[PDB]
Design a protein around this nucleic acid. Structure first.
Lengths: 83, 100, 75, 100, 84
DNA sequence: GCGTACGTGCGTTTAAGCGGTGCTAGAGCTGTCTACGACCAATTGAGCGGCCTCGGCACCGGGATGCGTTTTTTTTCAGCGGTAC
DNA sequence: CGCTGAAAAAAAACGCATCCCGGTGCCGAGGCCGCTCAATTGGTCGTAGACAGCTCTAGCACCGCTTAAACGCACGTACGCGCTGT
């Protein structure tokens, strides 16, 4: 459930913590699985691009920069890993 | 010698104040890392990552979700509710223009 | 509030509303404030005296269940 | 014999079907044009406009609003409603990230 | 002799209806008509401001189709069929 | 279940839209003259990687400060249902 | 009326967690210091863009007319909305 299904490593109480930052008071049970689903889709979309940047650099190791360039491409630009 | 008990929602409110004010990442760093690599393997095998490239992702993720929730919360409230539900998210994302 | 009892105020509201469905808790909670004299915990004592005229049988409940809905008297 | 009357919402539904299916601009072209120029004068005086540049704006506007409403409508429905209200819009725009 | 009026109200209740009808809207609060005007203003304002700015840079006194497009592109609302 | 805001329809009012007119602002193009910016070659200090040093900030435990929870403490009712005239 | 019993409305008492102290270590901001290269100088070349002039697009303004659409009003439904129960 946690090794070829690491998604479950996104712990109910961790998702709670996030939503608590979001200013959420009360949280449906169905949400935990929903959130996983979305996070997957997100990381999928980003990493796909990030890797694609790596594949173009003929590297087999993914860099910080690769990620940033990808996040910028998914209109989610990130400061503090070197714009 | 007696039940002392906070009423449902009083600790939530505390938790909010506590985590709003702080900036430390809120997902456990390994379970996340493992997740990253698992999803990587979909697109190419035997891939390495700068320790910074992982952290970088995690930052973006958490912040995104925190964002989503903020918006989701507002979708819930709009329905005269205080409890977020799948349908609340599904709306946010639809308006945000993430899905159809 | 120089008033009758709350077992002869809801009975003096239905006799003045010849309705085949009855008089509701929201057609009674209005009648009690307009005509008679009443305090401020009025909409909370009408309700508390239409569970003590339902379990007895003084007041009959056409469509509803509890204190929300419409009632009329026995015959 | 009464005169004949459609029940509230039955003509709305027709109007929807009618306007969804068609593509002609829905704001009257001069009143719009006048509006454009009025707002122009704020930023510079004695400004002229290509007949195409006006129409171009109008296209973008209508389509935007139609968009907004679609999203707004969904915000209304989410509140178990069928009538859009200011608060419905205000939400859409907030999630869309137009206002704060 | 080009000096303008209070044209925002030229966005007619029945016109706004028409739009929302396209939007798939069945029932429409009265407060919405004014709300919509408000938003449309803000929109046209934001766009035109930029569009004019493009014109001011070209030292033209006439606004072109292209000016508008370039602006709408800048407001993540890109427009097809007027070039660019 | 309660109530009025909203959609419908109809009769009255408005001004968009149409196809045309004539007038010229200013769009848009050309051609020429030169002032400005690329290109090179030749000098050199400003800003980089590396490297030391030291105080702020991170904890730690300890003690008040103001929250909140639950319980006792002063307050109504408030309704009967017997009371009394 | 007092019975009495409900039910609330307050206040005092208990527990709780946060903040502000006290400090004392530890690492990362801060700077010095060594080369290295990337800015600057100075001069030369060519062509991009500003300026003046010339064409003519197309943008604006005026008229009078038809008629589709805007406007207003009056009626009543059905939908927002609040309240109470489960």
């Amino acid at each position: 459930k946690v090794l070829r299904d690491n998604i479950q490593g996104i712990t109910k109480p961790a998702i709670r913590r996030l939503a608590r930052r979001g200013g959420v008071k009360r949280i449906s049970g169905l949400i935990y699985e929903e959130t996983r689903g979305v996070l997957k889709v997100f990381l999928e979309n980003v990493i796909r691009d990030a890797v694609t940047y790596t594949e173009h650099a003929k590297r087999k190791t993914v860099t910080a920069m690769d990620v940033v360039y990808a996040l910028k491409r998914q209109g989610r630009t990130l400061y503090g890993f070197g714009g | 010698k007696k039940p002392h008990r906070y009423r449902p929602g009083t600790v939530a409110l505390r938790e909010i104040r506590r985590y709003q004010k702080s900036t430390e990442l809120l997902i456990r760093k390994l379970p996340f890392q493992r997740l990253v690599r698992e999803i990587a393997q979909d697109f190419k095998t035997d891939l390495r990552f700068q320790s910074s490239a992982v952290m970088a992702l995690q930052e973006a993720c958490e912040a995104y979700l925190v964002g989503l929730f903020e918006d989701t919360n507002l979708c819930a409230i709009h329905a005269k509710r205080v409890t977020i539900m799948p349908k609340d998210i599904q709306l946010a994302r639809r308006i945000r223009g993430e899905r159809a | 509030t120089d008033h009758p009892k709350y077992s002869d105020m809801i009975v003096a509201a239905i006799q003045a509303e010849k309705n085949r469905a009855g008089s509701s808790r929201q057609s009674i909670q209005k009648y009690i404030k307009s005509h008679y004299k009443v305090g401020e915990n009025a909409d909370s004592q009408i309700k508390l005296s239409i569970k003590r005229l339902v379990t007895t049988g003084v007041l009959k409940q056409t469509k509803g269940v509890g204190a929300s809905g419409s009632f009329r008297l026995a015959k």
